[PDB]
Each structure stands twice: as C-alpha cells, then as structure tokens.
Amino acid sequence: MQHNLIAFLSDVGSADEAHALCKGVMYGVAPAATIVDITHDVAPFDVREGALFLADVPHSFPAHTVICAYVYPETGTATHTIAVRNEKGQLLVGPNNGLLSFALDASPAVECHEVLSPDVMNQPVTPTWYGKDIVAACAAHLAAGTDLAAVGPRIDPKQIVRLPYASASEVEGGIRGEVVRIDRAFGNVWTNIPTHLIGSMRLEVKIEADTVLELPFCKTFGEVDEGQPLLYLNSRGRLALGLNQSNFIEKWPVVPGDSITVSP
Amino acid sequence: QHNLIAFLSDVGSADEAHALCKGVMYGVAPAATIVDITHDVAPFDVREGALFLADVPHSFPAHTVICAYVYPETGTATHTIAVRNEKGQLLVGPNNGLLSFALDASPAVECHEVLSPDVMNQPVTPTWYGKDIVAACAAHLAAGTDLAAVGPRIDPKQIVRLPYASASEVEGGIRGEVVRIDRAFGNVWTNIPTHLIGSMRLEVKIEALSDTVLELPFCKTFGEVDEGQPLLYLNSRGRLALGLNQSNFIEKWPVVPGDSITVSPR
Amino acid sequence: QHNLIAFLSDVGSADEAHALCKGVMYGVAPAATIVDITHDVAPFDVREGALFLADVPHSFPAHTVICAYVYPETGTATHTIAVRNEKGQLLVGPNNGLLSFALDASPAVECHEVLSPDVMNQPVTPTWYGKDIVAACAAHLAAGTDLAAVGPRIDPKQIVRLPYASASEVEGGIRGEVVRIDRAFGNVWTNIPTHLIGSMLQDGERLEVKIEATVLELPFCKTFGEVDEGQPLLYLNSRGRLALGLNQSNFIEKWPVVPGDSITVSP
Ligand SMILES: C[S@@+](CC[C@H](N)C(=O)[O-])C[C@H]1O[C@@H](n2cnc3c(N)ncnc32)[C@H](O)[C@@H]1O
Ligand SMILES: C[S@@+](CC[C@H](N)C(=O)[O-])C[C@H]1O[C@@H](n2cnc3c(N)ncnc32)[C@H](O)[C@@H]1O
Ligand SMILES: C[S@@+](CC[C@H](N)C(=O)[O-])C[C@H]1O[C@@H](n2cnc3c(N)ncnc32)[C@H](O)[C@@H]1O
Ligand SMILES: [Cl-]
Ligand SMILES: [Cl-]
Ligand SMILES: [Cl-]
C-alpha cells in the first residue's frame, strides 16, 4: 500500500519556477517521497498530448508510484480532480477532463474518487492553480499515507471522461491508419498501426498531406543507409517512419491526424 | 535539519553544467534530496532569477536550502552569502540582489558571507563560484554544517536589494505595471495586489509605445469567458493578471515587463 | 555500493521517453537516487554526448553509476558496455565512443559487454536499447549486481574511442580549435589547456587570436568582470581550457565560430 514515488506531468513548462513550487508543496506534505518529472513541456491546454505522454507511464513505473498529472484549462470550475487506483496498484491524480484516458487504457481503474476533501488540498486553494493546490497536494497526501477513500466520494469508472482514440483497420488493399504523434527529438512519425496488423504483409506507404513511398520494413534504423527511409515497429509496438540518422518530418512534413496507408 | 536543496541558476538545463553542480552537492551531502527550481533563467538576468525565487520560500518546507546563482560577477569581489530566514530555511547565493524578493517574502534573521575554504569545492574556479562556492556551501549546510562555519556575520542591511515599483490608487483607478509574463501561456502579470482592487467590467489601459484600452470582465478563472476571449483575474500569487481563455494574450496584444497598466471602472 | 545514477541521453526532456527509463530504473533499484546529466544531447551526436560526459567522473562521487546513451546503432551488433573506472564509479553505455572522454578523465579498470538477459528489461525492444539494456543494467548495478554478471570481460582497447587532438605549439604561437560552444552564454571553448597559455603569457597579459571561419587583440583575464560589459576576453574556463567570451554578452552572436574552426593564439 506504500506509494513513495511521485511521477509528475503538466503543461506549465520547465522554464520558470511554477512546476517546482508544486514540488515544494509535495515535499512539505510527503517529505520522504521521491519526485520525478515525466515532463512539464506538454503544449499549453493540450489534454490529448498530455494523455498520449502518460499512456506508457503505468507500464514503465513500479506499483508504488503516484502518477500526478495536470493539464487543467478548466481549473477553478466544476471540472473536478479525480484520484484512481489502477489494476497495477498505482495511484493516479489529475483533472477529470480526459488527461488520464490512455494511462487507464494501459491499466484500468479499480477504485475512483472525486477529490473534494479540504484536508488533502493546499489551503487556501487558488482558483487558477488546482494543479498545485489540489492535484499535486492530493498526490503528496496519498504518498504520505492518506487513504484513497479519504479524498472524497467514490465515483463509477464510467464517470471518468475519456478521449476517443482512432484504431487502424484493414481496407481494400492494405491497412489504413493515421499519425498519432511525432517522435519530435528525431523527427520520426508514429502511427496507430499495431504490430499484429502489419503481420499479414518492401511496402507501399501513402501519406495524405499525397506522397507514395516504397519502404523496407526494418527492425531498427541501422538496417538502411544513413539518410534513407524505413518502416519499423517503434518501442510502443506501433508502426513508425524514420530516416536513419536524419529527420523524416523535415523531408516529408506530416502532422497528427494525417492518414497513412500501408499496402504490399 | 535541511536535507532538501532547491536549486536555481542561469546555466541552462541543456548541457551537463547544472548536473556537475549536483554531483558536487551529492558528494558533500549524499543523503540530501536535490530538486531544481529552474536552470533556464535568462543569462546574467539577476532580476528574472529574483522574481522566480520570490514565492519559493512560501511553497517549500522549512527544511529547505534555497541554492541559487545568476552570477556574472563570479571571480570578483562580489561575495556569496548564506542566510537563515524567518521560516527557518537557509538560502545561499551572489550578494547581487538575486535573493532580494525571496527575502521580501521571508526576511533574513542571520546573514554570513561565505568565505571559509572548508565549505567550498577546492580549488575554486574563478568563472564558476556557483559550483565551487554556492552549490558546495549549500550542500555543506544540507549535510549539517552550522551556518556560522561558512564565514563572518554581516548585517542584513548589507544584503543588496533590487528595486520594485508598487501599484497605487490614482485619479479614478489603480496604476501599476507589468512585472512578468506567464510565458508558457502568454498571460500578463502585474504588481497590483488583491487588497487595492477591492473598491472596484473594468477599463484596462496598457501604456507602451502605443496604448491598448480594453474593457474586460473581472473573473475568478479562465473558463468564465468564452475560448479566445480576454479576462482580468487574480493570479496564483495574489496579483492582477490578463489572459485569453485557452489562448495567448501577449501574442494578440504585445506587452513587456515595465509597461504601465491602469485598471478603472467602465 | 553505487546508489546514485547520473543519466544522459539524446531523447530530449520535452516528452515522457527519458522518464520511462527512470521508471524502469526505480523499479529495479527502488532505493537509488536518479539525477539527470542532460537529455538534450543533439540527436545521434555521440561526440557531443562524449564531451558532455568528460567532466562527469571528476564532479560526481565514487558511488555513481554513469548511465548514458546516444544510440543510433540500437538493435544492431554494437553492444552496450559496463565499466568500472579508477575512481571506482560504474559507467554503462553503447560501445560507440560515447564514454571516450569520461574514460580519458578516469580510465577503465574492468570492462564487460552487457549480454546477460537478467540485467535487461525483457523483452528488449530493438529501437530502445537505451531503456531496456543501458538504463536497466545501470539500475541492476545500483541495486548491487556484480559487474561481472552483466556479461563477458573485454579488454579496454575493445572500447571504441573518439579521436580528440589537444592544441600544439607551432612557430611562435598555439594552434588549437573550437571544441564546443558554452551555448547558454555564447562563450567559445577551445582544446588549448592551461599549461600551453601559461608558457606564453607576459606582464600586461594581452594576446592576438586569429579565427579562421578575424584577428582580435584580447586581454587574458581570470573572469568576465575584468573587462567592460560587451567587451571581449580570453580566459581559462571552469574545465582548464582557453575560452573566448564577451562580458555579459554573446561572443558567437558577434563572431560566429563552430566546432572544428581553427583558433591560433600568439603574443
Ligand atoms: C495557471 S497554470 C499554473 C502555473 C502559472 N505559471 C502560475 O504560476 O499560476 C495552471 C493551469 O492553468 C491553465 N491555464 C493557464 N493559462 C490559461 C489560460 N490563459 N487559459 C486557460 N487555461 C489556462 C493551464 O492549462 C495549467 O494547467
Ligand atoms: C560560466 S557559468 C558556469 C557554467 C558553464 N557552462 C561552465 O561550465 O563553466 C557561471 C556563471 O557565469 C556567468 N557567465 C557566463 N558567461 C558569462 C559571460 N560571458 N559574461 C559574464 N558572466 C558570464 C553566468 O551568469 C553564470 O551564472
Ligand atoms: C528511439 S530513441 C528512444 C526514445 C523514443 N522517443 C521512443 O519512445 O522510442 C533511442 C535511440 O534511438 C536513436 N534514434 C532515434 N531515432 C533515430 C533515427 N531516426 N535514426 C537513427 N537513430 C535513431 C537515438 O540516437 C536514441 O539514442
Ligand atoms: Cl491548474
Ligand atoms: Cl558562477
Ligand atoms: Cl537506444
């Protein structure tokens, strides 16, 4: 039942003190906790980007983790904060605005509460920063031995707002998916096409804003010459496009939501 | 005890430099927790660093060593100081005004110049007192060195302070200025405190190379206006701020620190 | 014992990737302290990563595991290595030259290839050996795994080394080059060590520098504040090598210079 590791995500940036003031509040409540950032460089207000960044956090982090996350343009409104215990035994705290959707896909909710108890908040709560005074504060209380049931009333899992996620499908001559996100440090393109779908089938890849490439399917970057394009399964088990030691989206610009079709 | 070190500088987080300081600190105080405030203070910008530190004493617990350096005077006669504040925290930094606003929040009770070689990383490199004096001294304090071992007592009046303009009641409203931009979002932060905005949609007059006059609703939070619409609100630091709901105010209406802001009834 | 993990990569700090590695490491070594060096090494730039690691052994205590990857060879025959240095630290990284300059600072005493599946995060994903081999193995070492259990011993000469030339005395001067930019400030760092400029300094301490990319006549100073704001200076940087800067301004914004550009210094 111990949760001494707090994994922390927001959209407030890492460039000023704000993300650190949250950690100050958390160390004051849970002075023995380990606090590690996931990132604070989610694009402003971008709940979907935050949700995508959290997707693989449950799997990589141990059971004694509190996932503390906010992207909270609804701060100071009726949009509540929730605290969840997942099937892995981790705790998650965040706004009920879809942010935790893909982390919960990875490890479903077992018990879910609205955070309404003043005793798990940093008082007085400032309306424009529930992320510090409710989300961070509550996560730290959970790390410091507070029972999940003490944060507020139980809700059903279906009361957690979920962001829709497009799945790739078999079409009439291949697999139709889309760009989910860019691997931005490198310029690699990540799709929603899972391992099991490319199983069936060099491949033709059609990128719609329209470009057709004939690409080798490789296990890794070094299997083609430097600067050459490849298809590969990324670290997350989904089909990706890259140039070996270059930047694919600088050569073929593509944004999230663009269609990607793969055929023999 | 002071086993939590909160660390700020202007050396950036993009290369190893900020981490070499943590290596020195972990060597001296291997049981300390080190947490960054930020290393992305603009280069040489002591005032920006001072503003970023202002609310650190209130948010961090009493067992914190606030370790901060923006030190273009490194290797000169500008000394490093170590301070114990009214909250019981310790602060270490260049006596160049960097700690000024943190000390406004929680005044100095005890002040020393850091002159003892035994709290430094020897030999001290002239271009990086931040590592070899500031960071090293903070770690010795985290490891339980008495504040008196760092060097001699000085009067708190010898702590260099940065000037800070106050807002005031003027003919028919409140006149202040822009203190900083909430840069992740483009929100505008003023020096107008909650207590002055009590008597009084409001007229907001921004004076820069051109004047921008807006009629804005006073809201508790962003979602009280439509997406893209402007609002006046009290920020998380208790001061009047301007923003657009889920958009960037300064991208629409450019404003920089030092610009005048008046708020008056419609 | 090695309870402190110092972590470097090229995956950036802007998304979750660097943190997923920390999650794996905390799972394996729950009592370890993890501190980033940086994740903002330029993509695939092994030499930049090697330069960022050069001064890590000296600054970090003996109980450190230096965990580093810049690994465009991930999923190939380029193995991960684990090394014990003369300071008693452990280092884990791709055998692609990344650890070269850290090993210059504190040489390898024992070296192994990381091949044992029991020090990896299974199943190992081919495009991220940095998570599933480098980070996982560093965590196992921090948790107390013996260095010899990671895989077979190799000779130090089997560690790939990136070439680095220090400057030399030529007819009447020092011929060096730009190694890296102090990018937060725009200061220029050369390969000219302390002992070479020492030999050439006279009373008044003024030098000529020729940049091939400009001739400047510059004062040799201890620190920035010795000349007026905006004025140029030569100085020995924090790492013991000659540098160029403007006091409280950006030298490379005025005089653009990139790594490998010649810098000649004469009386
Ligand atoms: C105001 S920020 C807190 C940090 C800020 N620098 C401070 O010190 O108050 C907290 C949340 O507010 C939201 N937010 C910030 N500016 C906003 C705006 N203009 N419109 C809507 N939401 C905003 C963000 O999504 C963020 O998660
Ligand atoms: C030199 S930096 C230390 C980090 C650097 N990357 C290193 O490894 O030496 C330390 C301090 O020097 C100051 N500084 C750096 N470059 C400067 C310059 N050109 N003029 C004046 N001060 C400078 C900064 O304000 C900073 O707080
Ligand atoms: C793929 S990155 C791991 C992080 C990534 N965001 C992920 O989640 O998989 C691991 C290593 O891959 C290398 N790498 C990434 N993209 C590459 C590409 N297009 N070509 C060659 N190497 C690449 C980098 O050098 C890096 O050290
Ligand atoms: Cl918030
Ligand atoms: Cl310094
Ligand atoms: Cl890798």
Side-chain angles (χ1 to χ4, degrees), chain A residues 1 3-169 171 173-205 207 209-264, chain B residues 1-156 158-168 170 172-198 200-265, chain C residues 1-170 172-211 213-267:
Chain A
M1 32 208 51
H3 291 90
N4 44 289
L5 179 60
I6 301 170
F8 187 30
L9 174 137
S10 77
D11 64 337
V12 308
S14 54
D16 75 9
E17 76 285 7
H19 72 290
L21 301 185
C22 294
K23 297 182 195 172
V25 168
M26 291 197 285
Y27 283 125
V29 169
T34 297
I35 305 178
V36 60
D37 291 334
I38 301 165
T39 180
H40 295 292
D41 286 304
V42 177
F45 330 127
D46 196 332
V47 177
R48 179 175 288 271
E49 179 169 79
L52 286 168
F53 288 4
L54 293 169
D56 294 322
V57 167
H59 173 71
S60 292
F61 276 74
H64 57 99
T65 305
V66 184
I67 301 169
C68 177
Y70 70 91
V71 177
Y72 211 163
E74 311 86 351
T75 180
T77 74
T79 297
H80 297 308
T81 297
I82 52 171
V84 176
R85 185 179 336 267
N86 69 14
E87 284 183 4
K88 183 162 180 177
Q90 301 160 328
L91 298 171
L92 305 91
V93 187
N96 190 11
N97 63 4
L99 180 59
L100 298 177
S101 299
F102 309 144
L104 292 174
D105 291 344
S107 181
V110 176
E111 184 174 5
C112 313
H113 293 256
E114 288 177 338
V115 178
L116 302 180
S117 169
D119 293 342
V120 302
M121 302 179 184
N122 185 59
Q123 302 286 348
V125 174
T126 197
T128 64
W129 205 2
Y130 277 15
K132 178 166 70 70
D133 292 338
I134 307 188
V135 177
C138 186
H141 283 287
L142 295 172
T146 295
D147 299 327
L148 175 62
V151 308
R154 191 161 184 162
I155 58 169
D156 295 326
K158 73 181 198 176
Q159 294 183 260
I160 301 173
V161 172
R162 304 293 276 260
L163 302 179
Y165 182 87
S167 31
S169 49
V171 279
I175 300 303
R176 185 189 192 81
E178 67 186 68
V179 176
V180 168
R181 60 188 285 204
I182 306 306
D183 195 11
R184 289 199 191 135
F186 311 109
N188 309 315
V189 172
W190 286 5
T191 77
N192 61 349
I193 302 168
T195 299
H196 78 257
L197 277 193
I198 40 149
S200 325
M201 43 184 92
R202 285 195 155 214
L203 300 176
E204 175 189 278
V205 57
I207 304 171
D210 291 73
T211 292
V212 179
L213 303 175
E214 190 168 295
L215 296 189
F217 179 75
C218 300
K219 185 177 111 317
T220 195
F221 306 107
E223 290 177 0
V224 297
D225 294 343
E226 287 194 38
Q228 295 296 300
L230 62 145
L231 283 168
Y232 64 101
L233 289 170
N234 70 18
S235 55
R236 318 304 177 85
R238 292 182 181 250
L239 195 66
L241 295 73
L243 297 176
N244 179 24
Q245 293 195 49
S246 192
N247 184 319
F248 185 99
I249 60 144
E250 284 177 354
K251 185 162 189 168
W252 296 288
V254 117
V255 305
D258 287 350
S259 294
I260 307 285
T261 306
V262 182
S263 20
Chain B
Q1 232 219 357
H2 293 89
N3 48 335
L4 177 59
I5 305 172
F7 186 32
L8 174 139
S9 78
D10 61 338
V11 308
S13 52
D15 74 9
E16 78 280 14
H18 73 292
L20 303 183
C21 292
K22 297 190 201 171
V24 166
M25 292 198 286
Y26 286 123
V28 167
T33 301
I34 303 177
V35 61
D36 292 331
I37 301 165
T38 179
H39 297 292
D40 288 301
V41 176
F44 330 127
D45 197 335
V46 176
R47 183 173 192 89
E48 181 169 83
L51 286 169
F52 288 2
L53 291 170
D55 292 321
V56 168
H58 173 73
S59 288
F60 275 75
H63 56 102
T64 303
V65 186
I66 301 166
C67 175
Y69 68 91
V70 177
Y71 213 160
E73 309 91 351
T74 180
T76 75
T78 299
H79 299 309
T80 294
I81 52 166
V83 173
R84 179 178 36 99
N85 70 13
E86 284 183 1
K87 183 162 179 174
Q89 301 162 324
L90 297 174
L91 305 91
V92 187
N95 191 9
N96 65 2
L98 179 60
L99 299 176
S100 197
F101 303 146
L103 293 174
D104 291 338
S106 182
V109 175
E110 183 169 0
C111 319
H112 296 254
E113 290 171 338
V114 177
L115 299 182
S116 171
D118 294 331
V119 298
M120 304 177 186
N121 185 61
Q122 301 286 345
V124 174
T125 199
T127 66
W128 207 358
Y129 278 12
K131 179 167 67 73
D132 291 339
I133 308 187
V134 181
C137 184
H140 283 284
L141 295 173
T145 296
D146 299 331
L147 178 57
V150 308
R153 283 170 71 170
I154 60 167
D155 195 313
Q158 301 228 267
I159 300 172
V160 171
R161 302 300 279 261
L162 298 182
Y164 187 87
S166 301
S168 51
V170 298
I174 298 302
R175 183 182 184 87
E177 69 175 55
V178 178
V179 169
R180 56 190 288 206
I181 306 309
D182 194 10
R183 285 203 194 115
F185 309 111
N187 308 316
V188 177
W189 285 8
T190 76
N191 59 353
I192 297 161
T194 295
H195 85 252
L196 269 191
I197 196 88
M200 67 190 100
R201 287 205 161 207
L202 300 175
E203 184 197 276
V204 180
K205 177 200 198 167
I206 302 154
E207 301 180 50
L209 287 183
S210 67
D211 295 344
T212 311
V213 186
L214 303 172
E215 190 170 294
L216 300 187
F218 180 74
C219 299
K220 287 196 167 197
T221 196
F222 309 107
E224 290 175 0
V225 300
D226 290 355
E227 278 137 311
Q229 294 295 300
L231 63 144
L232 199 64
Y233 62 102
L234 280 176
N235 68 19
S236 61
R237 322 302 177 90
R239 279 126 167 246
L240 219 48
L242 300 66
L244 295 178
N245 180 23
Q246 294 196 50
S247 196
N248 182 321
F249 185 103
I250 62 145
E251 282 177 355
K252 178 168 194 168
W253 296 291
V255 128
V256 303
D259 291 344
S260 284
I261 308 282
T262 304
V263 181
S264 317
Chain C
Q1 237 214 59
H2 290 92
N3 197 238
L4 177 61
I5 305 171
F7 185 32
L8 174 140
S9 77
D10 66 335
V11 306
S13 53
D15 75 11
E16 77 284 7
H18 71 293
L20 300 185
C21 295
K22 295 184 198 172
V24 167
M25 291 194 289
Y26 281 123
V28 166
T33 296
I34 304 178
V35 61
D36 293 331
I37 301 166
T38 177
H39 296 294
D40 286 304
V41 176
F44 330 126
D45 197 335
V46 175
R47 177 172 290 269
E48 180 169 87
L51 287 165
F52 288 6
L53 292 170
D55 292 320
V56 169
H58 169 75
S59 291
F60 275 74
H63 57 96
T64 303
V65 186
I66 300 170
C67 176
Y69 69 93
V70 177
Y71 211 162
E73 308 88 353
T74 180
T76 76
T78 298
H79 299 307
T80 299
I81 53 169
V83 177
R84 185 187 322 273
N85 69 14
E86 284 187 359
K87 184 162 176 172
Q89 301 162 323
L90 299 170
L91 305 90
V92 187
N95 189 10
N96 64 2
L98 182 60
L99 299 179
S100 299
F101 308 146
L103 292 175
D104 290 342
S106 179
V109 179
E110 299 108 285
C111 318
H112 295 255
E113 290 173 341
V114 177
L115 302 179
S116 165
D118 295 335
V119 300
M120 304 178 184
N121 184 60
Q122 299 288 347
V124 172
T125 196
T127 65
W128 208 357
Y129 280 13
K131 180 164 68 69
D132 292 338
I133 306 186
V134 178
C137 186
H140 283 285
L141 297 171
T145 297
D146 293 328
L147 175 61
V150 309
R153 190 155 182 176
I154 57 170
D155 294 322
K157 81 174 191 186
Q158 292 178 267
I159 301 172
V160 173
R161 304 294 277 259
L162 303 178
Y164 182 97
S166 188
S168 48
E169 306 179 87
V170 297
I174 298 150
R175 184 172 201 93
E177 68 186 68
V178 178
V179 170
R180 59 186 287 203
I181 308 306
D182 193 12
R183 288 206 222 284
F185 308 113
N187 311 315
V188 175
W189 288 2
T190 75
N191 60 350
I192 302 163
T194 295
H195 77 259
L196 279 194
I197 38 145
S199 76
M200 147 170 317
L201 278 176
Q202 292 327 300
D203 201 6
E205 291 178 319
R206 286 164 296 267
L207 298 174
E208 183 177 285
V209 2
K210 169 150 190 182
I211 304 165
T214 293
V215 180
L216 304 172
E217 306 186 325
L218 294 188
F220 178 75
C221 301
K222 285 201 168 179
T223 196
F224 309 107
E226 287 174 1
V227 298
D228 206 7
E229 291 184 31
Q231 294 295 300
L233 66 145
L234 287 165
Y235 63 101
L236 288 171
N237 69 18
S238 59
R239 319 304 177 83
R241 291 183 196 89
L242 193 67
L244 296 74
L246 294 179
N247 178 24
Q248 294 193 45
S249 194
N250 183 320
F251 186 98
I252 62 143
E253 283 178 353
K254 185 163 188 119
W255 295 290
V257 111
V258 306
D261 288 349
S262 291
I263 307 286
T264 304
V265 181
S266 313

